[PDB]
Swiss-Prot record, chain A:
Subcellular location: Cytoplasm; Nucleus
All copies of domain CWF21, residue ranges: 35-72
Taxonomic superkingdom: Eukaryota
Compositionally biased residues, Polar residues: 60-72
Protein name: Pre-mRNA-splicing factor cwf21
Originating organism: Schizosaccharomyces pombe (strain 972 / ATCC 24843) (Fission yeast)
Subunit and interaction comment: Belongs to the 40S cdc5-associated complex (or cwf complex), a spliceosome sub-complex reminiscent of a late-stage spliceosome composed of the U2, U5 and U6 snRNAs and at least brr2, cdc5, cwf2/prp3, cwf3/syf1, cwf4/syf3, cwf5/ecm2, spp42/cwf6, cwf7/spf27, cwf8, cwf9, cwf10, cwf11, cwf12, prp45/cwf13, cwf14, cwf15, cwf16, cwf17, cwf18, cwf19, cwf20, cwf21, cwf22, cwf23, cwf24, cwf25, cwf26, cyp7/cwf27, cwf28, cwf29/ist3, lea1, msl1, prp5/cwf1, prp10, prp12/sap130, prp17, prp22, sap61, sap62, sap114, sap145, slu7, smb1, smd1, smd3, smf1, smg1 and syf2.
GO terms of biological process kind: mRNA cis splicing, via spliceosome
Family according to the record: Belongs to the CWC21 family.
Keyword Phosphoprotein carried by entry: yes
Full protein stretch here: 2 to 145 of 293
Originating gene: cwf21
A GO CC term attached to the entry: Prp19 complex
Phosphoserine modified-residue sites: 77
UniProtKB/Swiss-Prot annotation, chain B:
Span of the entire protein shown here: 436 to 483 of 2363
Cysteines engaged in disulfide bonds, as pairs: none
The name this protein goes by in its record: Pre-mRNA-splicing factor spp42
Function: Involved in pre-mRNA splicing. May be involved in endoplasmic reticulum-associated protein degradation (ERAD) and required for growth at low and high temperatures. Required for pre-spliceosome formation, which is the first step of pre-mRNA splicing. This protein is associated with snRNP U5. Has a role in branch site-3' splice site selection. Associates with the branch site-3' splice 3'-exon region.
Entry superkingdom: Eukaryota
Gene: spp42
Subcellular location: Nucleus
Quaternary structure annotation from Swiss-Prot or TrEMBL: Belongs to the 40S cdc5-associated complex (or cwf complex), a spliceosome sub-complex reminiscent of a late-stage spliceosome composed of the U2, U5 and U6 snRNAs and at least brr2, cdc5, cwf2/prp3, cwf3/syf1, cwf4/syf3, cwf5/ecm2, spp42/cwf6, cwf7/spf27, cwf8, cwf9, cwf10, cwf11, cwf12, prp45/cwf13, cwf14, cwf15, cwf16, cwf17, cwf18, cwf19, cwf20, cwf21, cwf22, cwf23, cwf24, cwf25, cwf26, cyp7/cwf27, cwf28, cwf29/ist3, lea1, msl1, prp5/cwf1, prp10, prp12/sap130, prp17, prp22, sap61, sap62, sap114, sap145, slu7, smb1, smd1, smd3, smf1, smg1 and syf2. Interacts with prp1.
Length: 104, 48, 48
RNA sequence: UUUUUAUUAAAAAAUGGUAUGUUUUUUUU
């Protein structure tokens, strides 16, 4: 009749019901560092893309200078030599990785 | 209201709300049982 | 029975083990116990 | 981890214990 305690009706038993509370109830790192290595390679690639953006901005500056010389469209500063200066960047970053591995 | 229909004298209970509400605390056992039994009779009256 | 209110007869005496099966549905094995389901819950939301 | 609350009833008759069945007329001629 209440919280699962009691009998449905006191009729039929010699008792009045009246359930009571018990009153005595006891109520008690990363193993594959190649992850970091690949993250570093990816961030180096994104730095390369950042330098490509810088190259495009320099190309816009070159286009403005060419238009000014004509006064006295869109052009590209360097088609492939920027890849060689990027190769220098690869050499420098490889040297940096070698030095860091030497330090560790 | 200010306007009604003059029920009969015996149709006014005058204390029905006393036991329709909860029982006041610290009352003896027999009083609590009386409250509960009167409420039971009222519930049976309303059900049918 | 709400502990301040009336107590009546069962009105439904059909609860024998005619199924003879616990139905593997209400078993403790597959049930998350968080709080006991009081009868106030069974009265406030009778259909759930 | 602190607190509780829950209170069936209920008396009278006949069985049952001073059976029962009986029981007083106005005409004859």
């Amino acid at each position: 009749s209440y919280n699962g305690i009691g009998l449905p009706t006191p009729r039929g038993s010699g008792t009045n019901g009246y359930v009571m509370r018990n009153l005595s109830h006891v109520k008690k790192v990363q193993d594959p560092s190649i992850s970091e290595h690949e993250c570093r390679r990816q961030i180096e690639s994104k730095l390369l893309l950042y330098r490509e953006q810088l190259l495009e901005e320099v190309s816009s500056q070159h286009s403005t200078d060419a238009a000014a010389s004509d006064s006295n469209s869109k052009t590209k500063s360097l088609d492939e030599a920027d890849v060689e200066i990027l190769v220098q960047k690869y050499r420098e970053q490889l040297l940096k990785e070698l030095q860091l591995q030497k330090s560790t | 209201k200010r306007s009604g229909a003059t029920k009969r004298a015996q149709d006014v209970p005058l204390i029905k709300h006393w036991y329709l509400e909860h029982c006041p605390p610290n009352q003896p056992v027999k009083v609590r049982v009386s409250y509960q039994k009167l409420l039971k009779s009222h519930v049976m009256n309303k059900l049918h | 029975a709400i502990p301040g209110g009336p107590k009546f007869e069962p009105l439904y005496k059909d609860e024998a083990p005619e199924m003879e099966d616990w139905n593997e549905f209400n078993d403790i094995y597959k049930l998350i116990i968080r709080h006991p389901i009081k009868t106030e819950y069974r009265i406030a939301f009778p259909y759930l």
